[PDB]
Amino acid sequence: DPVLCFTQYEESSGKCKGLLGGGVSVEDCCLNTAFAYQKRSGGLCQPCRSPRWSLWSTWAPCSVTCSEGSQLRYRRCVGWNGQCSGKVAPGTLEWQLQACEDQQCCPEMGGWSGWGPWEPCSVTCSKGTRTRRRACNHPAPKCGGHCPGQAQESEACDTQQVCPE
Amino acid sequence: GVAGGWGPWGPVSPCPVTCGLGQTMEQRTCNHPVPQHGGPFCAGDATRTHICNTAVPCPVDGEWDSWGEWSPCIRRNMKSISCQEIPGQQSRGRTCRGRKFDGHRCAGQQQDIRHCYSIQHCPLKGSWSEWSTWGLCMPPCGPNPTRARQRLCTPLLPKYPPTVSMVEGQGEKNVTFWGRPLPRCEELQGQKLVVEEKRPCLHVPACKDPEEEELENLYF
Ligand SMILES: *[C@@H]1O[C@H](CO[C@H]2O[C@@H](C)[C@@H](O)[C@@H](O)[C@@H]2O)[C@@H](O[C@@H]2O[C@H](CO)[C@@H](O)[C@H](O)[C@H]2NC(C)=O)[C@H](O)[C@H]1NC(C)=O
Ligand SMILES: *[C@@H]1O[C@@H](C)[C@@H](O)[C@@H](O[C@@H]2O[C@H](CO)[C@@H](O)[C@H](O)[C@H]2O)[C@@H]1O
Ligand SMILES: *[C@@H]1O[C@@H](C)[C@@H](O)[C@@H](O[C@@H]2O[C@H](CO)[C@@H](O)[C@H](O)[C@H]2O)[C@@H]1O
Ligand SMILES: *[C@@H]1O[C@@H](C)[C@@H](O)[C@@H](O[C@@H]2O[C@H](CO)[C@@H](O)[C@H](O)[C@H]2O)[C@@H]1O
Ligand SMILES: *[C@H]1O[C@H](CO)[C@@H](O)[C@H](O)[C@@H]1O
Ligand SMILES: *[C@H]1O[C@H](CO)[C@@H](O)[C@H](O)[C@@H]1O
Ligand SMILES: *[C@H]1O[C@H](CO)[C@@H](O)[C@H](O)[C@@H]1O
Ligand SMILES: *[C@H]1O[C@H](CO)[C@@H](O)[C@H](O)[C@@H]1O
Ligand SMILES: *[C@H]1O[C@H](CO)[C@@H](O)[C@H](O)[C@@H]1O
Ligand SMILES: *[C@H]1O[C@H](CO)[C@@H](O)[C@H](O)[C@@H]1O
Ligand SMILES: *[C@H]1O[C@H](CO)[C@@H](O)[C@H](O)[C@@H]1O
Ligand SMILES: *[C@H]1O[C@H](CO)[C@@H](O)[C@H](O)[C@@H]1O
Ligand SMILES: *[C@H]1O[C@H](CO)[C@@H](O)[C@H](O)[C@@H]1O
Ligand SMILES: *[C@H]1O[C@H](CO)[C@@H](O)[C@H](O)[C@@H]1O
Ligand SMILES: *[C@H]1O[C@H](CO)[C@@H](O)[C@H](O)[C@@H]1O
Ligand SMILES: *[C@H]1O[C@H](CO)[C@@H](O)[C@H](O)[C@@H]1O
């Protein structure tokens, strides 16, 4: 079955670099074990060297930003005509799962306290704004929490007073 | 307004490689009919390429396989030297693998010898080690992964000479310890040899293809 035959295999990232062309058999392309191949061009670049396990990828981000979690890393068997260590065929994957911990504590939101008294009106003639405010300290949040909503409300007030002309 | 066209194709290059596949190319010029004053140009490509196939494989230099298992520590004409001050010699083996098609041979000693004592199945006093480093979450991707750390009863190796004058070799060679002893020690929570403890791993991620996991998080 014909395949695209590439002249160099980039280690560390698995890409097929330097296209020599297509419409040639896998056996002919891999006469030079320094070459690499890709079929249908969807992906999966396999070097023509004998099969050997690749390098462990970098640890994936922890599954949660909170408390103990779990993170993976992969390793692919890359090559052609043979097997990797483990009676494994080329293309298979092997995983290692590890317990991770980005931060110790975790955001626990708090609760609003009682409403403060209404402040006076923002103006002494015509119409203005009235504001009341509360605190996020019943209970206070730990780590990165915050109370749900706003810490202050505003509303219009009418003084019933005309301004000096 | 003069129309250019191509001239004869030149000589094709020979197959630049001696193994596997290579590439050749022919060079033509737009010299016989020339494009004057900038009107039309030469249509096409001034270079064709073609693959040439040498039917002979490339050399592949053999690489060293990993070291084998240390052989049993013995001494000539004395049978088992276990739990005794008798230095022996054990050997290890490598295999040169992958050499094909006149490739270079592996470079180095395929064997490795070292002097040793034998503590195979010897009863030794022991002491409980501290808590080892938390291992990997196993089985990875399987149902309910769990970690494991452990304290094991480490043997107290006997104070034997680590530097011995070999009379047959006339050298002062180092001597290390080989074998699985039987460590004696007070029990640690109903156990005499090893006591471990497991803890489940939390929020396990599913195992998908590294391309597929990349395209899944990008799409959400
Ligand atoms: C054990 O001895 C080695 C070197 O001596 C021997 O090694 C054996 C494996 C065997 O092949 C035998 O024939 C050979 O004679 C010591 O290596 C030395 O270590 C010191 C300090 O660690 C270094 O400064 C030296 O460069 C290094 N090499 C030499 C040639 O001296 C090794 O330290 C020793 N181990 C112990 C625990 O004593
Ligand atoms: C990663 O960063 C952390 C700081 C949190 O913001 C995580 O969000 C989630 O927060 C709630 C608390 O409201 C916890 O119960 C969750 O466990 C945590 O996932 C965020 O993912
Ligand atoms: C409170 O009492 C009112 C009767 C006014 O005297 C107010 O002063 C007025 O404020 C407006 C804008 O706030 C200004 O345009 C006027 O010039 C000023 O007379 C007072 O604050
Ligand atoms: C021609 O004869 C062969 C028997 C090999 O010795 C060839 O060596 C190979 O040459 C190509 C480039 O021309 C390299 O890609 C290979 O790494 C090399 O083994 C020789 O050229
Ligand atoms: C991953 O694991 C170890 C390093 O952590 C090595 O055996 C190798 O680098 C592998 O890719
Ligand atoms: C995970 O582990 C260490 C960092 O904790 C590094 O080897 C690397 O970042 C890997 O992804
Ligand atoms: C304060 O605001 C409302 C109650 O008024 C709720 O979202 C919650 O109790 C918060 O603490
Ligand atoms: C202030 O607003 C109302 C009462 O006016 C309630 O949602 C609550 O008591 C809050 O503290
Ligand atoms: C403002 O509104 C009334 C009094 O006008 C009360 O609910 C409270 O004092 C609030 O602060
Ligand atoms: C040169 O190349 C081809 C003929 O080989 C045509 O496209 C055209 O004649 C051009 O001049
Ligand atoms: C080169 O290629 C072919 C001959 O191989 C012809 O189309 C023509 O001679 C061109 O110059
Ligand atoms: C054997 O010796 C060491 C490991 O003990 C390494 O140099 C290498 O893995 C070799 O095969
Ligand atoms: C021989 O030495 C020890 C076992 O005593 C290990 O490093 C390994 O098994 C090697 O083959
Ligand atoms: C076993 O090992 C030593 C004694 O040999 C102590 O750490 C303790 O008694 C443990 O049970
Ligand atoms: C393991 O447990 C704790 C540390 O987690 C200590 O008591 C000691 O290091 C033991 O080995
Ligand atoms: C496992 O747990 C933590 C690290 O995750 C440490 O207490 C220690 O490394 C232990 O082996």
Numbering used by the authors:
A (entry chain A): 28 to 192
B (entry chain B): 255 to 474
Quote the study on this structure.
Whereas, the disulfide bridge pattern in six thrombospondin repeats were those expected, the three cysteine bridges 32–56, 43–73, and 57–75 in the N-terminal TB domain differed from those annotated in UNIPROT. We therefore confirmed the disulfide bridge pattern by two orthogonal techniques. First, an anomalous Fourier map calculated from data collected at λ = 2.48 Å confirmed the three disulfide bridges. The deduced disulfide bridge pattern and a homology search conducted with a preliminary model of FPcΔ3 showed that residues 28–76 folds into a TGFβ binding (TB) domain and not a truncated thrombospondin repeat as earlier proposed. In summary, comprehensive structural data and mass spectrometry analysis demonstrated for the first time that FP residues 28–76 fold into a TB domain.
